[PDB]
């Protein structure tokens, strides 16, 4: 067969150890989820806006007593209510408090005032994958694989907790000072052991069964991994067009084309992730995540060494010191106004 006796034994043991790890991690998550660190705004100096959204913004801050830098996501409670994202905001905080994994950003403090909600997390100084990818053009297959391996492990972890992620894309992946990935956004993540039905995500990364309004499951995240690996390795995503509706027609068609520089191993992996037939999609079969991890394209990947952060990264972002924001774009700076009247108190009582 493909493996001789020593390699088959090694792989079986590895796969059993993963099960042992996940069972412990699930116990730890559930204890934190059931029995969940405040601070206040004047504990921090505000330095610079690192990124913006419809909710509010993310700012670099420095914690006054300790001198540590953090990234502070500020959400305007009234805008959250208007954008129908109360449950999403409360869920994101609950997830971030409860998870623990080397590629998931660490929430350090949270708090709220009359106007806003605040989530203070580790600062990840290396910037968005998105920026680096557009700047360099494309990543080599080894460079793409190093990142892809981290997403595979992170999804193996999240899915073990019954969490579906649902908004993978380069925009949502940050690079830390050692060149490893950090996932920070959980705005569409949901606990789903069974199926779920909401239309959500980003057009280029939507799985066909989401577009087709079916009940769907964690396999949508493995489709999205396909999209990400393709985009990292090509420099552009597999399905694009001027308008979303034309993207969707490409996604559901069952057709994908590849650059001539893609390896055959890469193309085989992507045809198995970008599989419109759920009964054939990798990550959704009886062998689960192991179909992905044991694929030829990942044959050089030492999964434990990636988890331990002992692999030399392909790319180490520029870092001139704590507080360096050079790997982030410039955004228009708006004041943080706090109303003298409490807004939306009942909606956000659990935050």
């Amino acid at each position: 067969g493909h493996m001789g006796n020593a390699a088959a034994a090694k792989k079986g043991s590895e796969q059993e150890s993963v099960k042992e790890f996940l069972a412990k991690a699930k116990e730890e998550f559930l204890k934190k989820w059931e029995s969940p660190n405040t601070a206040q705004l004047d504990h921090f100096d505000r330095i610079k806006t690192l990124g913006t959204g419809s909710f509010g913004r993310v700012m670099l801050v420095k914690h006054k007593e300790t001198g540590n830098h953090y990234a502070m996501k500020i959400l305007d409670k009234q805008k959250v209510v208007k954008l129908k994202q109360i449950e999403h905001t409360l869920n994101e905080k609950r997830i971030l408090q409860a998870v623990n994994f080397p590629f998931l950003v660490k929430l350090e403090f949270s708090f709220k005032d009359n106007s806003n909600l605040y989530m203070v997390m580790e600062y990840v100084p290396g910037g968005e994958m998105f920026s680096h990818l557009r700047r360099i053009g494309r990543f080599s297959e080894p460079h793409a694989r190093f990142y892809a391996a981290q997403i595979v492990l992170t999804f193996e972890y999240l899915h073990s907790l019954d969490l579906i992620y649902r908004d993978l894309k380069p925009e949502n992946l940050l690079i830390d000072q050692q060149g490893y990935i950090q996932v920070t956004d959980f705005g569409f993540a949901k606990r789903v052991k069974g199926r779920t039905w909401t239309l959500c995500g980003t057009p280029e990364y939507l799985a066909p069964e989401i577009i087709l309004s079916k009940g769907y499951n964690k396999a949508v995240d493995w489709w999205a991994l396909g999209v990400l690996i393709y985009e990292m390795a090509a420099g552009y995503p597999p399905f694009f067009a001027d308008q979303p509706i034309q993207i969707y027609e490409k996604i559901v068609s069952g057709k994908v084309r590849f650059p001539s520089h893609f390896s055959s191993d890469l193309k085989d992996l992507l045809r198995n992730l970008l599989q419109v037939d759920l009964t054939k999609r990798f990550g959704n079969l009886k062998n689960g995540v192991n179909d992905i991890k044991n694929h030829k394209w990942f044959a050089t990947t030492d999964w434990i060494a990636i988890y331990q952060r002992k692999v030399e990264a392909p790319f180490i972002p520029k870092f001139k010191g704590p507080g360096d924001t050079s790997n982030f774009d410039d955004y228009e700076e708006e004041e943080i106004r706090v109303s003298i009247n409490e807004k939306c108190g009942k909606e956000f009582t659990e935050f």
């Binding site: 995500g201 980003t202 280029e204 420099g235």
Partner: peptide
């Protein structure tokens, strides 16, 4: 090329969720 088609899509910047 396919890259040129990508540039023509106008979706080369940060993409919003739906």
């Amino acid at each position: 090329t396919t890259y040129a088609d990508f540039i023509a899509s106008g979706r080369t910047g940060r993409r919003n969720a739906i």
